[PDB]
A and B are shown apart, each in its own frame.
Chain A
Amino acid sequence: AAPSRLVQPGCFICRGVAVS
């Protein structure tokens, strides 16, 4: 089988305040 990636969830925190 071809080498498949293993992307895992990122550094996920926020949904309501964008950074300046």
Chain B
Amino acid sequence: PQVLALEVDCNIECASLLDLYGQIEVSRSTFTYMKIADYGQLGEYTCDAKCDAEFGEPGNIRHLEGKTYDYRGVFCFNRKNLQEANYDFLSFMIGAAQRSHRINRNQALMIGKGVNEPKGWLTENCFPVFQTLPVDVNGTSTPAFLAQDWRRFVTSFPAEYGEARSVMHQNVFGYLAAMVDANGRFLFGDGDLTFTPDLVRERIRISNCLPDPTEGNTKGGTGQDAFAAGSFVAAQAAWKTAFYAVEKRPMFFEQYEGGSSAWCVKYQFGAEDGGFVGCCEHGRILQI
């Protein structure tokens, strides 16, 4: 009988893989763009004293286009407890749907499957994927993932594509910082109880709803804890040209007169957005 204002909720978001992808804004729900397939060969090293030439072979210029998909839902009330309550269901619920939008959108742009959802770059599976070699232990051939791989993966990006960041679940970065060499020493941060360099300088943006290969941080791997080869660990791409996220209209909430039967006041919300993968040559995937 002494109700407080304490509102312990204890629910988490992810990070946001939105400020990486190239942003474009469109008004209509159907946009179209051109693509340069290949310039083609024009002109050979012809001989001398030859009053002639060769037409070569012209290039190719395709014309692509993509739609925008919508995202909507419904939530209603009973209008009786809404008048006697000591709290505000509306402002809690309006925040409760937009909370569902941000996490559904970012996840859909990653793992989207074809119809009525933007095809994510994971399921698209046109990013060249690199898999790592397994290791030996007591004759067993368990799969593993060493720091020698991570340096090899990041540096193998073509330099002429530009600078490229990387994305990974924080549990693998904890797996990186906690490695030990032969005798007893850590590979990174020798003797300071923690290794935490400025991520922005090593071009490593971190997230928490990626496939997370080390299952619940319980799959390091010496015996039956092998990484279960065939799992996503990290990705790396020139995101400002490898994937685009389109935006048309932010969320709206409109009362639905009709359907509200004088007991159950029913609100309606929706939004329009979308995404598509650009040239998926800038961008590679690491796996166990």
On whether A and B touch (CB less than 8 Å), the answer reads: yes
The answer to the question of B116 belonging to the interface, with a C-beta cut-off of 8 Å to chain A, is no
Residues 1-20 of A contacting B (Cβ, < 8 Å): 4-15, 18
Find A6's partner among B135, B136, B217 (CB 8 Å cutoff): B217
Question: B285 to chain A: closest CB distance in Å?
Answer: 21
Number of A-B contacts (CB under 8 A): 42
Bound Cα distance from A18 to B146, whole angstroms: 17
Bound Cα distance from A10 to B179, whole angstroms: 8
| Given contacts A4-B216, A4-B218, A9 and B133 within 8 Å (CB-CB) | no
Residues of A within 8 A of B180 (CB): 9, 11
Bound Cα distance from A13 to B179, whole angstroms: 10
Residues of B within 8 A of A7 (CB): 218-222, 225
Question: A15 to chain B: closest CB distance in Å?
Answer: 5
Residues of A within 8 A of B24 (CB): none
Residues of B within 8 A of A11 (CB): 180, 182
Bound Cα distance from A14 to B180, whole angstroms: 13
| Given contacts A5-B218, A6-B217, A6-B218, A12 and B178 within 8 Å (CB-CB) | no
Residues 73-93 of B contacting A (Cβ, < 8 Å): none
| Given contacts A7-B221, A7-B225, A10-B221, A15 and B133 within 8 Å (CB-CB) | yes
Bound Cα distance from A5 to B219, whole angstroms: 9
Residues of A within 8 A of B136 (CB): 14-15, 18
The answer to the question of B237 belonging to the interface, with a C-beta cut-off of 8 Å to chain A, is no
| B136 nearest in chain A by CB position | A18
| B174 nearest in chain A by CB position | A8
Residues of B within 8 A of A13 (CB): 181-182
Residues of A within 8 A of B217 (CB): 4, 6
Residues of B within 8 A of A6 (CB): 217-218
Bound Cα distance from A16 to B135, whole angstroms: 8
Residues of A within 8 A of B168 (CB): none
Question: A10 to chain B: closest CB distance in Å?
Answer: 4
Residues of A within 8 A of B182 (CB): 11, 13
Find A12's partner among B133, B146, B218, B219 (CB 8 Å cutoff): B146
Q: Using a CB–CB distance below 8 Å, which chain A residues touch chain B?
A: 4-15, 18
For the complex with contacts A9-B178, A10-B222, A12-B146, 7 further pairs of A-B residues with Cβ separation under 8 Å are A7-B225, A8-B175, A8-B220, A11-B182, A12-B144, A13-B181, A13-B182
